[PDB]
C-alpha cells in the first residue's frame, strides 16, 4: 500500500533521527507493528525504530545517546510491518543513507579517499622530482617506478572528483568585460 520512506539522506551520528513517515504502515494498521529497520551494510546488527507517537500521525524518533556508537559508513533503510497471528511480515520500503562520522568526538578522521589519493600523489611526485631514477638496481634488487606520464593522469582525475564533492567543480569562466 502507501509508503513514506524518507529518512534524511545525510544522517549524522549521535544526533536524533526522525522522518515521521506519512503512510507506510497504513496497510495492516490495526494488528501490525512499525519498524524502519536500519542495517549496516558491511557488518553490524540491524537496529530498529518503533513508534512513540501521536495517534493521528505516526512520528518516528531515535534518541541521540543511543545513536552514539553506530557505524560510520553506508546504511540501508527497509520498513517492515509484522503480525504474529498473521505469521507474516510485509515490506513496503527501500532506501540508502550514509552515516557521517560523529562530529563531536574522536582522535582522528581524514577526508574521503579522494583527498588521500591526491595528497599522496603530491608526495610521490615530490620524491621523484629529485633523485631521478627508473631503475634503482643494486646487487639483486630492482624497483622500476611507474612512468611519469602515468602518475600525472591519476592526479587529474582525482583532482576533479575532489572538486565535484566540494562543489567548486563548475568549469571556470573569465569575463572579458573590456
Amino acid at each position: 500500500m502507501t509508503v513514506s520512506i524518507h529518512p534524511p539522506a545525510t544522517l549524522v551520528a549521535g544526533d536524533s533521527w526522525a522522518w515521521e513517515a506519512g503512510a507506510v504502515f497504513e496497510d495492516h494498521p490495526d494488528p501490525w507493528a512499525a519498524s524502519y529497520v536500519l542495517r549496516p551494510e558491511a557488518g553490524g546488527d540491524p537496529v530498529t525504530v518503533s513508534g512513540g507517537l501521536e495517534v493521528l500521525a505516526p512520528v518516528f524518533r531515535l534518541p541521540a545517546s543511543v545513536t552514539a556508537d553506530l557505524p560510520p559508513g553506508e546504511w540501508t533503510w527497509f520498513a517492515v510491518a509484522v503480525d504474529a497471528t498473521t505469521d507474516a511480515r510485509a515490506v513496503l520500503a527501500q532506501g540508502r543513507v550514509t552515516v557521517i562520522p560523529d562530529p563531536l568526538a574522536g582522535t582522528e578522521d581524514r577526508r574521503t579517499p579522494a583527498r588521500r589519493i591526491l595528497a599522496a600523489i603530491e608526495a610521490t611526485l615530490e620524491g621523484r622530482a629529485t633523485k631521478d631514477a627508473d631503475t634503482y638496481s643494486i646487487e639483486g634488487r630492482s624497483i622500476t617506478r611507474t612512468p611519469l606520464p602515468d602518475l600525472l593522469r591519476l592526479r587529474a582525475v582525482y583532482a576533479e572528483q575532489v572538486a565535484r564533492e566540494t562543489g567548486r567543480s563548475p568549469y571556470r569562466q573569465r569575463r572579458v568585460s573590456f
Binding site: 565535484r164 564533492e165 569562466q173
Partner: protein, 438 residues
C-alpha cells in the same frame, strides 16, 4: 496484355475480380468512421471540407427561378413571384424550416453538402402536420443499420438497410432508430439520399477523401514529429564529451535534489574546460522538407480532385497563367457536384412542398393546374475572373456578334436577367430625381 496479370514481384492485384458492392459497403462503414476522425484531428481535409462547402454552396445559396410556360409571352411573372416569395419566406429564419430552430434553408444546404463530402452522402426527412408543414430535418449517417440483411420469401433483399422490391426497386429504408425503439422502416418518400454517382453499381457513396486519407494521416504524424525533434535539437546545446577515464563515483545523493544552474549571462565568457567539447548539429529536417512535402502533397490533391494551390495554400512559384489554369480545372469539378446535389434535394423538395403549401393556401394560386407552375429551375453561382478588362471587352464584342445572348452572361455570375431588369427599372426611378447617363 500480360501486364497486371498477377503479383509476382510487383503486384497485389487481388486474385479474382470481385463485386465493388460488398467491398464498397464494408469499406464505407469503416470509412465514415475514419473520415470522421481525420477531418477532426489532422489537417488538409478540414480544408477540403471548408473548400467544398464554400465553393459549392452560396453567398446567396442556391436560388429558385420558375418559368410558367414558354418564356416569350406564355410564361407570366405573377405565378413566379408568388412561388419565389413563398419559398424564400420560410427559408428565412422561422419556426417552419426545421424541428430545430437554430437553422434555416441556407443552413440546411450547406450542411447537407458538408455531410456529403465527408460521409459520401447524407439524407433528409420531411414531416407534415406538426410543422404549415413539410419541415426538413437532417439525420446523421451513422443511424443507418448496416446489418439488416436476408430476403423475405415474398420479398426482395433488405441488405445495408435498403428495402428492395419484387421489381428490385427502392421503396423503403431501414434506419436504426432514433437512438430508443430501434428499427423503423421509412417510406422512400420521406427519406431521400443524395449520392454523387461514380461507379454506377452502388447502393451507397464513399467519402471523397478516401484516396488521400491514408497519405494525410501519415503526413500529420510526420509534421508532429519533425517540429518536436527540432525543438530538442535546439535545446540540448553543447555536449561536453569525455575520454574514457573519469567521471568516477559521481555521487548518487547530490543528484536527487537539483539540476545545477550556471550563469553565462555575461557577454564575454571565455570558458576553460577539463577535457573536451562538442557542438550539436541539428539534423532536424532543415530545407529538405519543402520539396519532399510538396511532392507527396501533389498526389493527395490529384486524388481529391482539387488544385493543390487551393487545397493547401503553398501559393508559390506561380505565374499568372498557372493560376488561371488551375482555377479552370477545379471549376469544372465544382460545377459537376453542384448540379448533382440539387439534382436531387431541390427537385424533390420543391415538388413535394408545392402541394401542401397550395393546400394550406400559404401560396395563393389554384391547385388543379399544377403543371403550369410545376417547372422549377435552380440557379448556381459562378466565380469571378482575375482580369476584368479583357472579359469586358470580349463580352462587348460577343454581344455585338449576336453570338452570346445577354442572358447567358448574367447566368455565369448567377444573378439572372429578370433580376437585372428589375434593378434597371429601379435605376430609372433614381434617374427621375437626379440624372441617368451620358
Amino acid at each position: 496484355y500480360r501486364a497486371a496479370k498477377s503479383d509476382r514481384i510487383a503486384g497485389g492485384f487481388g486474385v479474382f475480380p470481385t463485386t465493388p458492392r460488398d467491398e464498397l459497403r464494408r469499406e464505407i462503414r469503416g470509412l465514415v468512421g475514419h473520415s470522421r476522425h481525420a477531418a477532426q484531428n489532422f489537417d488538409y481535409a478540414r480544408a477540403y471540407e471548408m473548400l467544398t462547402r464554400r465553393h459549392v454552396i452560396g453567398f446567396n445559396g442556391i436560388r429558385l427561378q420558375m418559368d410558367v410556360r414558354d418564356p416569350g409571352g406564355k410564361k407570366d411573372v405573377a405565378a413566379g413571384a408568388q412561388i419565389e416569395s413563398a419559398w424564400a419566406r420560410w427559408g428565412k429564419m422561422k419556426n417552419s424550416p426545421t424541428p430545430c430552430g437554430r437553422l434555416s434553408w441556407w443552413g440546411v444546404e450547406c450542411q447537407v453538402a458538408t455531410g456529403i463530402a465527408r460521409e459520401g452522402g447524407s439524407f433528409v426527412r420531411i414531416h407534415q402536420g406538426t410543422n404549415f408543414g413539410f419541415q426538413v430535418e437532417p439525420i446523421p449517417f451513422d443511424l443507418l443499420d448496416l446489418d439488416l440483411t436476408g430476403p423475405t420469401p415474398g420479398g426482395g433483399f433488405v441488405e445495408s438497410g435498403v428495402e428492395f422490391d419484387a421489381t428490385d426497386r427502392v421503396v423503403a429504408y431501414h434506419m436504426w432508430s432514433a437512438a430508443a425503439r430501434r428499427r423503423l422502416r421509412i417510406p422512400a418518400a420521406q427519406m431521400l439520399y443524395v449520392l454523387v454517382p461514380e461507379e454506377i453499381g452502388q447502393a451507397l457513396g464513399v467519402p471523397r477523401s478516401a484516396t488521400a486519407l491514408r497519405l494525410m494521416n501519415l503526413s500529420e504524424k510526420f509534421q508532429e514529429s519533425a517540429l518536436t525533434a527540432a525543438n530538442y535539437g535546439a535545446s540540448n546545446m553543447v555536449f561536453f564529451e569525455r575520454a574514457a577515464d573519469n567521471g568516477v563515483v559521481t555521487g548518487p545523493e547530490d543528484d536527487a535534489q537539483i539540476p545545477i544552474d550556471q550563469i553565462e549571462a555575461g557577454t564575454l565568457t571565455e570558458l576553460p574546460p577539463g577535457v573536451k567539447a562538442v557542438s550539436h548539429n541539428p539534423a532536424y529536417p532543415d530545407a529538405a522538407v519543402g520539396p519532399f512535402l510538396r511532392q507527396m502533397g501533389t498526389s493527395q490533391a490529384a486524388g481529391l480532385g482539387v488544385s493543390y494551390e487551393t487545397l493547401t495554400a503553398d501559393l508559390s512559384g506561380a505565374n499568372f497563367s498557372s493560376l488561371r489554369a488551375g482555377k479552370g480545372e477545379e471549376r469544372e469539378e465544382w460545377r459537376m457536384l453542384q448540379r448533382a446535389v440539387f439534382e436531387g434535394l431541390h427537385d424533390r423538395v420543391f415538388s413535394r412542398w408545392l402541394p401542401l403549401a397550395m393546400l394550406s393556401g400559404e401560396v395563393r394560386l389554384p391547385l388543379a393546374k399544377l403543371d403550369k407552375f410545376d417547372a422549377a429551375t435552380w440557379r448556381p453561382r459562378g466565380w469571378p475572373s482575375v482580369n476584368p478588362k479583357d472579359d469586358a471587352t470580349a463580352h462587348e464584342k460577343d454581344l455585338k456578334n449576336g453570338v452570346r445572348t445577354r442572358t447567358e452572361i448574367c447566368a455565369e455570375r448567377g444573378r439572372d436577367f429578370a433580376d437585372v431588369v428589375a434593378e434597371a427599372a429601379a435605376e430609372r426611378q433614381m434617374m427621375r430625381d437626379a440624372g441617368l447617363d451620358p
